[PDB]
Structures are given as structure tokens and as C-alpha cells.
Amino acid sequence: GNNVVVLGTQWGDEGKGKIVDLLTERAKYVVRYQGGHNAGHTLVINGEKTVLHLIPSGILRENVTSIIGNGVVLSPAALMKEMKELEDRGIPVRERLLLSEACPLILDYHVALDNAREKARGAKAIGTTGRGIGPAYEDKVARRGLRVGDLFDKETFAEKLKEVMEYHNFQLVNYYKAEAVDYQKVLDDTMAVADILTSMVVDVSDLLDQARQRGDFVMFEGAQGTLLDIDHGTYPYVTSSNTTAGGVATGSGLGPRYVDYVLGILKAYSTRVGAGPFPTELFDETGEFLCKQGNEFGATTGRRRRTGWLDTVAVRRAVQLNSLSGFCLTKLDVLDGLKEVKLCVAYRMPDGREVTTTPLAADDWKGVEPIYETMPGWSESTFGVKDRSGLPQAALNYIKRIEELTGVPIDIISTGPDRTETMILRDPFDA
């Protein structure tokens, strides 16, 4: 399919950046349909790293026009930050990148708010990345926010800005007893980058309609993961946007009927950053082993990531939700050395029932325990293996049972962080 969707089947941090960069070879466009700079999509070409946060993972490819769609909450400061960094490394970000005038803006006050609300939660803190994501999405739905296109008239912007900040500060100071963030300062910072963004502005939905009509290879890149969906996730321990493929047509403008292949990025084991349910969570050396080996530390915050065995149940939901066409198995080599391996095949409900369906809101997950199928590990090395013939029978079996369990094929297998340390058993643009 020309229009391929690559998204996180778990809780984010499955390894999407690498796959977007990988598959972008034949693509003319890469589009982010949601999230913000809360992400940390890491690219490694020949061993040279690049951590992307807001910038689409097709930024290091001459042929690709990277696009930040309307669904995405844009932080002027972060964008400017990333560009220079890439520009200093030979990537003409401004010739490659495009953005929607529809994109919500994230400003100083959104972070202050993001932090007050979090603190306000005491023990019940979500573990948000503290980037004003939550608040930015709020102001939007409220029809009170600033989008990219408001910079079109700096006069009315400053007026609109004064009004909105006037409002937020009363709450910051008067309710949260927090300091007020200054209007003139945020104004000054904003209006100093205004001209840049506005020049990257294009009609994204009309744009993609033309590519589709011509048959161009479009790649929509997701951030976060299925279980962090604002609707379908473990509410309220979720992100503020829709991380399920449906957010593709809403935050890009593409016809829902034009999505061709939904590629699910599946890490060989689970991880979570931020508070929230996680059945297959391990608190033993096996879980610490995964931490040290998969190098599970937040790429935006640097927070230690919680680890666990693969959960085919939370995954099976992701499957149905995104109409996944196939999987890309990431970090399988992190399993090397393990004796026994475990996938979660079902959940034991607190009332004694056994189910193969996940609960919904965070509360509903309470006494839910995991049922596993233990499998033999493999001492052999898997790192860098670019073919199955090099994958040991166990590894191969683990993979197959996963397909069997989910009914979805492991189309690509990633055996290392570098672009080349991978296997494409089926190409999404082909099949």
C-alpha cells in the first residue's frame, strides 16, 4: 500500500523512529499525526545517533518531505531547538520540513500548568513528560487556543495571547499559588520564530489528497502507543491524543479510506514510563536485566523505564483497534541469554474469571494478573542478524507463537538499533 501507517502497539518506546527512517527509502512524505515533543524517536545510521522529539523521522532523507500535521501540538521553542541541532549536522530542516497552520501551539504557560496539575495530583500523578502537552490539547478542544495560523496577524495574536494568558495566570497564581508566567516574555519569544514556522505552513490535507491521487508513498508516523490513547488507553494514565490509527485521518486530514497498511511496531517485551497499569511488569533480575540491556530509559526525560514480558492481550486490543496489517518485531536480541521466555496469553480477573480481553480505564485493571506460556530462551547472539537463517530455532519459535497468538504476521524483525540490523520479510509498500 502507498499509504502506510507505522504506530506503537504497546505504551510507546517500541522503536518507531528507526522503522520510519528505515522504510522512508521510497517515501515522498512522512507525517506525524499526533503527540508533541514528548517523544524521543532515536535514529542510528552507521552508528550515528539522532534523537527526534517533534521532528518526523524522515528528516534525514533528501527525498522525503517531512510533515507535522494538524493533530500535532507544536511548541515553537522545541522546533527551533531541534532544527539548529540538525542544521549543525548538515540537515537542511527548513527545506525538508512542512507544518500545518492548524497545529496547536504550546507555550510557557502550558508547561507551568502541566506541572501544577501534576503536583496537584500528589501521589496520583500521571508521570507526564512536563512539556505542556496535556494543557495544549485542552485549550484546543476549548476553542481558546492558539494554532499556528494565528501568527498570520501578529497584532491580533498578541491580543489573543494577552487574553488567554490573562486567564491561565489567574488560575496559576490565584488557585495553584504558583508564579505567573509573563505575557510580554512569551510574546517576545514567540514573535521571534513566527516567520519561520509560517513559511513552512502548507495545506497538508489538500497536499496528501494530491499525492494519494498520484500514488505517492506516504508514511504516517505515530508517537506514544495504543495503551496511552486518550479514549482507548488506561485512562487517566494516558496521553492527551489518539495514538490509534484513527488519529491518522484526524490529525493529517487524509481520508480514512486511504490508509493502506497499518504497521504495528512490537517490542519483544513490554515497558512503561509514567504511572499506570502494567500486568506483565517484572520487579526481579529478569526485569532489571531487560532494563540494562534494552537500555530502557526515557529519551525525552531520561526516566528509568518499567519492564515486563510481552502481553499478547494488551497487544490483541492494539491489533483490533488499529486494524494492524502486520508487525515489526523490535529488540528481539535483548532476549539473548535468557533461559525461559514468557508471553502473556490471558489475564486472570479478580473475580476469578479468565479473559483474553483487556479492561479499559486504569481503575478497571486492579487485581488483574497475567497467565503465561513459558518458552525456552536462547544463549546465541541475535544482534545485527539481518536474516532468519541466523535466528536460532527458539527465537524463530517465539516469533511464530506470537503470530499465532495475535493472528498477525511479524513482517519485519529488528535485530539492532542501526538502520541495517533488520529483516523485511514483507515490505508494506509492496504488500
Place this chain on the structure above:
Amino acid sequence: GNNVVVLGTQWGDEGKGKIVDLLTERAKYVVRYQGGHNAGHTLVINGEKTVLHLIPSGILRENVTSIIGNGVVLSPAALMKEMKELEDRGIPVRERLLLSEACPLILDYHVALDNAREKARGAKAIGTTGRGIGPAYEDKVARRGLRVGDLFDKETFAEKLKEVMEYHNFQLVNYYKAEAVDYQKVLDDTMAVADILTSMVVDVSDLLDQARQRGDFVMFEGAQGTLLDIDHGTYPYVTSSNTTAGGVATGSGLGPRYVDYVLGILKAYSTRVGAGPFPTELFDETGEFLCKQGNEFGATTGRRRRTGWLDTVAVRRAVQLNSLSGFCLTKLDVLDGLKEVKLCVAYRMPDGREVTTTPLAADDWKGVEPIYETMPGWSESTFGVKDRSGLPQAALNYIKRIEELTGVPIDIISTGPDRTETMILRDPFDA
């Protein structure tokens, strides 16, 4: 296609209820994927009216399970209100209707907030329906809201409720100098309907996955219209959810790849309720004629609706956005008697350019004027005509040029408010 989407191509009030009720004949399920009780979907069977607001338009059909998906913001009070009304007329609402535990709740404080913010806008008021829609969607994205599933434990609910209201009231009283809405009262009202909703709760996304796998006829019903989309609409004069087909997979849980046919409901002329851009707006007898004849008055508020000629440009956007498979032409008989007819074929930009693409945010629409193609009307009557042979050549021509202009076929033509006063030139479930 089994999975048919029926949505508003304009600004809502195109006549969706009637088409949902119409086409539901072979459907097992009807799903609302967004909106709230801000809608007013009117059904007329043999001349008997039923105004639906939150209840899906497949509620008067024995064979159909009506579903209110997770995208929908649910007002406990409105639901209870509608049910009794239908129950008093022989519709066993509780045996027919199902709802998602994921659904956001709308309470007293959301309306108070909705009204303060509106007032707060002075002249720049949006013209919201004042049903707490805006605020309900806000609390959700904020991860501070109450969803249906919180009623699962009334103890923690009351606690969660106390906290949220505690917060809103400080702003109502302290900022907006408005009265505080009482916690115990809202608690009392809520907990008095708690058991009803919770018994209609089902797993909607898992549910629809099974129907899809079996090949059931599913009907997703939209509310509002394409130009009221929170992202793609005339921001901030929009609604707080996504009225484009992409909101189908996000507020239902259906795989974006499972939508089969997007049916666009197109009224023969335009209308708008609430503030906002409307190029083809008429302020002359022709525009008043349409008002009196199409009986254009808000079905939720009873507000006089603004009228205008058909705008193929605002429509052409809707087309691309929703990947429309076809159109259903509504209210064509309202045109009877007119001498000349006019469709908007392009816009004259304020800088002198001529475009066939619509601007985005409300501001961007400023000096935008419409370019028309005038056509001969028809004195003949069109009301009740169930076939083309009865449609006069002019009418027929108006229809064809519309297809030509948009590149999408008028699959169904509605010649009156009653279920039977229609024409299905192509059935969506068939083709």
C-alpha cells in the same frame, strides 16, 4: 460495504437522522462516534416526528442495536430525559441501546462553564448550544474528567467528583463571579441514574470487531458537520470534536481500515447556526425564502438558521477530508418555485486570487467572496417524488452539475422529511 459511514458534509443540519433511520433497515448496529445532545436528528415515519439528540437514529428499529461510542460526551440527565420520552411511545430504549464505559460525562458544572466562557466572549461568542459539550471534551483531554466507567465504584466517584467540582467552582465563583454549582446535588442526580447507564455498558470496539469479522451491516452516524470539525473546521467557530470520518475509528474503536462507504449528506443549499464564516450566505428574500421553506430553525435550541446557496468549495474540502464514496441530496424540493439557482464554484480571495480550495481557521475567511454558476430553477413540485422520472430536467441538471463539480455521485435523493419520500440510486451496503 458492510461498514457505512453517514456524515454531514456542511455545517450539520443536513438531514442525517432521516438517512440513518432510512438505511438502518438491514443494519444490526448504528453507532454515534461523537457529539453530544447538541444535535437534533429528526425522524418522520408516516408523518410521526421524533427528535433525537444524543440517541442514535436507529432507535426506532426492532432489529438494530443502537450504540453510543466512546467518542461521545454523555449527559446522564439528557439520556434519562430522552428514554422516558421514547419509552412513553413504545420504544424499549433500554433493550435497544448500548453505551461505552469510555464515554465522557457531562454534568451541571459543564453547562455553567459553557455559559460563562461564552458570555466571557462578549461579541466574540461562538453560539454554542450551551450543553456543556465544550467543557466535557476539555476535562477529558485534561485527564481530569469523569467517564461512564467511574460509576463502577460510587465511593471513589463521589471522591473524584468532589475534587473536580472543587476545582471548577473556584473558577466559576472566583474568576467568573458566577454562582457555584453544588456538589451534593450533582452527586444526588448522578447516582440516581448510575445503575441504568452501567447496565447498557458493553465493549463497543471489541463488539464491532466481531460484527466486522461476521460481516454485519454497521452504521456509524455523525452529528454536526465537516466545517464544525475541531481541527479541520472554521476554528474557533467549531464544535469540540472531529466531525470528519476519522472520528469514526477514534470514538467507536473500529479499525480505520474497516470503514467501507462514507456517505455524505448534502443539503441542496447551505445553513449555519452559531457564529462563523459562511461565504454563500444570503440576506435577501431568497435567503429568507429558504428559511421559511426548509424550516431552518435549530432543533436543539430553536435558533433561526442562516441560509445560503450551495458551496461546492466548502463541499469539495468535505469530500477530500472524508473520502466520501457518494452523496445523498437532501431538501431538493425546498428549491421548487425558484427562477434561478446558484452553486458556489470558486472563491475570490481578498488579494484578488481565484481559488477552489477553502481557507482554514475562521479568521482566514475574511474578505473571501463566492463565484457562482447560475442555473434555471423549477416551478414544479418535488416533494414526495420517489423517482427521477418525476424530477424536472432543471432539478436533474442541478444534480448532475453538482456531481461534475465535486466528482462525487448523488447516490440518494431526499424529496421530503418522511422515510419514504426518497430515492436510492445506489445502496451503500450494496455499492
